[PDB]
Amino acid sequence: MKILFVAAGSPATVFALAPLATAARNAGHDVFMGAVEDMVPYIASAGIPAVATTDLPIRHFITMDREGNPVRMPETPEEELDFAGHWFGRMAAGSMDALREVTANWRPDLVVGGSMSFAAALIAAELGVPYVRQAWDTGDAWRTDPAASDELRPELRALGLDRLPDPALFVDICPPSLRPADAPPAQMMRWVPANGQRRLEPWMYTKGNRPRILVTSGALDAEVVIATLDEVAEELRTELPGVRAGWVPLDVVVPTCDVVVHHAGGVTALTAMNAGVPQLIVPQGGNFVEAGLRISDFGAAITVDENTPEAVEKACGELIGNPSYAERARELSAEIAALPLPAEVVGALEGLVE
Amino acid sequence: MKILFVAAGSPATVFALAPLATAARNAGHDVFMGAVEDMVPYIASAGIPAVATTDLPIRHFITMDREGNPVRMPETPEEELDFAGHWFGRMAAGSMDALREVTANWRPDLVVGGSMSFAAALIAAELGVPYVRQAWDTGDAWRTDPAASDELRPELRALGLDRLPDPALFVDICPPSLRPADAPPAQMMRWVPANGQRRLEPWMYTKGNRPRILVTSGSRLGFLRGLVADMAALDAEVVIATLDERAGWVPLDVVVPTCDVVVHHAGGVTALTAMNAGVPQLIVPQGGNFVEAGLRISDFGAAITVDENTPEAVEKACGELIGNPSYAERARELSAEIAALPLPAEVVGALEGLVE
Ligand SMILES: Cc1cn([C@H]2C[C@H](O)[C@@H](COP(=O)(O)OP(=O)(O)O)O2)c(=O)[nH]c1=O
Ligand SMILES: Cc1cn([C@H]2C[C@H](O)[C@@H](COP(=O)(O)OP(=O)(O)O)O2)c(=O)[nH]c1=O
Ligand SMILES: [Mg+2]
């Protein structure tokens, strides 16, 4: 069958959907994936046919409302949910023209969107085909829905709907230990890494003679490796000469790490958990703060109060030196390993149209 | 488990192995794929961790012996198999130092090589882990083995072997109607397309009103220009699939379903793409080791192989493939055979059975 996948504005949204997308293609299905023009290369380099949902940069959707007025940046977790609901909503509305043009000529039998790819809901409803929503991290996929329904109220009304429709199937990748009690029924799925890849160098997959701390933005007897965009790493290399910096495929390097330090990146969190590696979360905005708190409260992470070289250092020492954090992290890895494989989940997609 | 895949010197070899490699990764395994430095970007852009087996291009192994002395190109179909055995043999030998260094730090539990990725056989033997050979086109995977075994004598003797070791498992993608009688036992697999991708434009996945003929010469870095000039008589839309460095790289998996004929140079994976989508094909052989396998597709009735370089030969063959329904009927028959074969996902379980 023909399946349209809809990712969003960031590479993690392509990566999180890639396992199920490639699983469907491996099962003989014809698969297209959509994302903003800037994300198209990430779809293509995941080996997936790529369509642009819009030729506008995401900042257009983030920093201004449907009228063109400035959007006040969120100062709190609660403000962040409403903020995210609205701008993902705006990006979804701006995605519809391109998606109609694609689907008039290549008609999908099913549409799969990520957590906040609301254009998938709209295009499926327009076409009269099942809408599948896949969680693209361990955070609640539905957490921005109220704001998103408001943002898309015009489009939803045109479809005879009062709010965002419930999906025909919710595919969740959140380990049972981390799922909140109010989580809606899901077809569970084992997450696997499918991040951007590079030519591998030995340091990436070889464990060193000292503990290794990976730092990414998406005192201690240890080495620090910086996982960042290559474009950024060039300038970073001048200011910090003797430190590994550049895009390093996280699935490859994380098994060599004692700690993964990140900004609250959902997919980085999954990579660390999956590998059984303790993680340090340093809040840098975003709505994944809450999902990070759950990992910390489970005992497989520490979330620090302040973004400080000082506060981070103490936490790193704790994650390395107290065996419990790695213990809980391996526990989460095992929970992930016990979930239904993407190959099996393709069967649930087939069942929706047969 | 850890699984090392070994591709070769051309993009088609990466693409052919990418379905099983990604099925393995989708199943929780840690998967690395090796190939010559020039192929590393193709591995990376298939979403697979990529290691270089050598820093030399495939042209190096093709055009020179081990001492650097020039070797001529084959002139006959018979010379092709022998010549290919030797250069694949040389490339395998030149891959061993890089593979030894990778596997000392990332030790695979299992090694998967394509049809003529002989370094996979060699490294698996060195490591004492199972070696799996996966056919990377519908041609006989073993067709260059005698010549490769001669080329690899020193390496094989070092391992206490007289010839290339048999795989622990052979994984075949050749549909039944095209398998020769002498074919060995195999775990069958449904081939799926996994070619390089680009941003799609409507013309790639929308067919027009008139028939559509795709022309290609493959993905290895003239004769394309003549093929299009032949098409000029027929009332057909012509699409040219070629390297970027319409005209350009167009993902074959996407556009072939909109075509009525695929015209190509005798490339194994292009043939598979056409057959898989049920599309008749015109094979215009430009050397290589797939020639006779293309003839099988010809003999079955799902293609025509143009005997030689003749003006209007391509044109008349195209006309016959468009207006005689039998070619597409046979092509759809091959498509159905492929679709009945075990999924890459099922094949991962057979790989697992080799180490579990
Ligand atoms: C920076 C970087 C990211 N990645 C991948 C890992 C994750 O799949 C993804 C990051 O997603 P995520 O952690 O959600 O961060 P953000 O959305 O803020 O970018 O990118 C690498 O593989 N290597 C790298 O060097
Ligand atoms: C030139 C070109 C190649 N390809 C892909 C299709 C096949 O998987 C592969 C060609 O492989 P193949 O036909 O075996 O020929 P060769 O070994 O000479 O490259 O490259 C495209 O998808 N689009 C293109 O425009
Ligand atoms: Mg409103």
Side-chain angles (χ1 to χ4, degrees):
Chain A
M1 80 184 85
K2 288 183 182 73
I3 307 171
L4 175 64
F5 279 75
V6 188
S10 71
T13 69
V14 175
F15 308 152
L17 297 173
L20 182 63
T22 61
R25 168 255 271 167
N26 282 354
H29 300 291
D30 306 285
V31 183
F32 284 14
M33 181 176 298
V36 298
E37 179 186 55
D38 272 7
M39 284 308 106
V40 156
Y42 289 95
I43 298 159
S45 290
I48 297 168
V51 286
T53 54
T54 172
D55 284 0
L56 299 175
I58 50 164
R59 182 185 192 78
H60 180 263
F61 304 110
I62 288 158
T63 60
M64 76 198 96
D65 61 34
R66 206 89 80 100
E67 283 168 61
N69 233 3
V71 172
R72 182 182 166 105
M73 290 309 190
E75 299 177 68
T76 70
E78 295 81 43
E79 282 179 20
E80 166 68 36
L81 302 174
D82 286 351
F83 172 73
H86 286 294
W87 86 255
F88 277 111
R90 281 191 295 269
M91 175 173 67
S95 295
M96 293 311 291
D97 286 334
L99 288 172
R100 286 183 191 113
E101 188 212 39
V102 173
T103 58
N105 292 308
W106 190 87
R107 197 189 179 92
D109 303 292
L110 193 139
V111 185
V112 179
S115 301
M116 293 93 183
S117 306
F118 304 112
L122 297 181
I123 199 62
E126 226 168 65
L127 300 164
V129 296
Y131 162 44
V132 174
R133 173 183 230 185
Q134 189 212 292
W136 64 27
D137 58 43
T138 66
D140 301 345
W142 62 94
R143 74 195 177 268
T144 74
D145 285 6
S149 297
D150 176 276
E151 182 56 52
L152 297 166
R153 186 162 301 122
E155 293 69 28
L156 291 160
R157 179 164 41 250
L159 289 163
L161 295 169
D162 293 334
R163 61 183 149 271
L164 281 159
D166 299 325
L169 182 70
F170 175 40
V171 179
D172 196 1
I173 50 167
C174 181
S177 276
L178 300 179
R179 286 186 104 236
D182 68 1
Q187 167 66 64
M188 296 312 296
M189 189 177 71
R190 175 171 182 179
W191 178 84
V192 303
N195 48 246
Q197 291 299 332
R198 299 291 189 280
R199 184 195 167 124
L200 301 184
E201 292 309 333
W203 70 262
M204 303 181 183
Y205 53 83
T206 309
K207 285 180 182 163
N209 286 19
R210 282 158 63 237
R212 166 182 284 178
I213 300 159
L214 181 72
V215 181
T216 191
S217 69
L220 314 157
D221 193 353
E223 281 293 308
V224 170
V225 170
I226 299 167
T228 196
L229 270 50
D230 288 320
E231 164 216 344
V232 179
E234 282 167 304
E235 292 131 312
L236 214 161
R237 211 189 78 202
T238 320
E239 304 184 83
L240 296 174
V243 181
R244 305 266 173 209
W247 182 284
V248 56
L250 245 64
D251 66 316
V252 179
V253 70
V254 173
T256 72
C257 298
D258 302 53
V259 191
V260 174
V261 182
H262 58 105
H263 50 301
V267 184
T268 298
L270 268 156
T271 312
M273 277 185 266
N274 186 54
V277 182
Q279 56 189 289
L280 204 176
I281 301 152
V282 188
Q284 297 303 123
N287 47 75
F288 195 81
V289 281
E290 183 60 63
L293 302 169
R294 290 172 189 168
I295 311 159
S296 311
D297 273 282
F298 185 78
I302 296 179
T303 304
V304 294
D305 292 359
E306 323 100 309
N307 181 350
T308 320
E310 173 177 295
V312 173
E313 271 165 16
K314 172 199 156 99
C316 279
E318 280 288 331
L319 297 169
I320 290 162
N322 180 346
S324 69
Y325 295 104
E327 261 166 49
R328 306 288 88 86
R330 286 190 303 274
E331 225 186 303
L332 290 175
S333 176
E335 283 184 25
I336 291 168
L339 298 181
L341 296 181
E344 267 68 70
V345 168
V346 168
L349 306 176
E350 297 170 343
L352 284 169
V353 304
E354 290 176 352
Chain B
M1 84 180 68
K2 292 183 179 74
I3 308 166
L4 176 69
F5 281 74
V6 187
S10 77
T13 62
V14 168
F15 305 157
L17 293 170
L20 187 59
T22 59
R25 188 214 59 208
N26 286 347
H29 304 286
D30 298 289
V31 180
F32 281 14
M33 189 178 285
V36 302
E37 180 184 64
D38 280 352
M39 294 304 100
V40 162
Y42 288 98
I43 301 175
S45 292
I48 304 160
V51 298
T53 54
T54 168
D55 278 5
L56 296 161
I58 197 186
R59 192 192 185 189
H60 172 87
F61 301 107
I62 289 170
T63 65
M64 286 162 285
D65 65 28
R66 296 214 206 187
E67 289 71 56
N69 298 302
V71 173
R72 62 173 188 79
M73 291 305 100
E75 286 148 8
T76 74
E78 294 78 59
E79 276 182 3
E80 290 275 352
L81 292 190
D82 184 65
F83 170 84
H86 286 277
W87 68 258
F88 279 116
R90 292 189 288 265
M91 194 190 86
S95 297
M96 293 308 289
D97 286 330
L99 287 167
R100 278 181 200 124
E101 184 180 286
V102 167
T103 57
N105 299 297
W106 191 86
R107 186 190 170 83
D109 298 297
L110 173 86
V111 186
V112 183
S115 300
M116 298 103 198
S117 296
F118 304 112
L122 293 184
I123 198 75
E126 248 178 55
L127 292 170
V129 300
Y131 159 56
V132 175
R133 176 186 227 172
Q134 189 215 286
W136 68 24
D137 58 34
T138 59
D140 297 348
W142 57 93
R143 68 191 180 264
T144 74
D145 288 9
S149 292
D150 176 78
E151 185 53 45
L152 292 173
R153 283 281 150 74
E155 293 71 29
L156 291 167
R157 276 203 288 268
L159 294 165
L161 303 173
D162 298 342
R163 56 166 149 267
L164 285 169
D166 291 319
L169 189 74
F170 176 42
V171 173
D172 199 358
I173 54 178
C174 189
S177 291
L178 304 168
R179 285 190 109 233
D182 68 11
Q187 165 68 58
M188 298 308 295
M189 188 175 66
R190 176 172 184 174
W191 176 85
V192 304
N195 47 252
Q197 293 293 337
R198 304 284 193 280
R199 183 194 174 130
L200 309 179
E201 304 297 337
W203 69 264
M204 306 179 185
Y205 55 82
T206 321
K207 192 188 171 183
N209 273 19
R210 53 188 191 165
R212 175 182 274 193
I213 300 160
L214 178 141
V215 188
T216 191
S217 66
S219 63
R220 289 205 186 192
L221 187 66
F223 114 105
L224 275 173
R225 320 192 187 198
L227 297 167
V228 180
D230 308 323
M231 312 298 172
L234 308 165
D235 68 323
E237 192 206 359
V238 178
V239 166
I240 312 165
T242 190
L243 293 179
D244 288 314
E245 60 270 68
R246 344 275 184 173
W249 185 285
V250 58
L252 246 55
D253 68 319
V254 177
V255 67
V256 163
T258 66
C259 301
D260 303 301
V261 187
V262 177
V263 182
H264 66 98
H265 61 302
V269 189
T270 297
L272 268 161
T273 307
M275 282 170 23
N276 185 59
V279 178
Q281 55 190 287
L282 176 50
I283 309 168
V284 193
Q286 302 287 305
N289 40 82
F290 185 78
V291 175
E292 90 162 56
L295 279 160
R296 302 191 176 152
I297 306 162
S298 268
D299 289 12
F300 182 72
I304 293 168
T305 294
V306 167
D307 289 310
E308 57 172 4
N309 309 338
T310 310
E312 306 199 43
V314 178
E315 181 183 313
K316 72 179 292 189
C318 270
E320 186 55 20
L321 292 156
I322 285 168
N324 192 329
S326 71
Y327 297 104
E329 285 178 337
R330 301 293 78 75
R332 286 186 297 263
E333 214 181 302
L334 291 176
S335 173
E337 290 190 0
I338 293 166
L341 294 184
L343 291 179
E346 173 167 5
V347 175
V348 173
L351 308 181
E352 288 166 1
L354 289 166
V355 322
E356 285 173 1

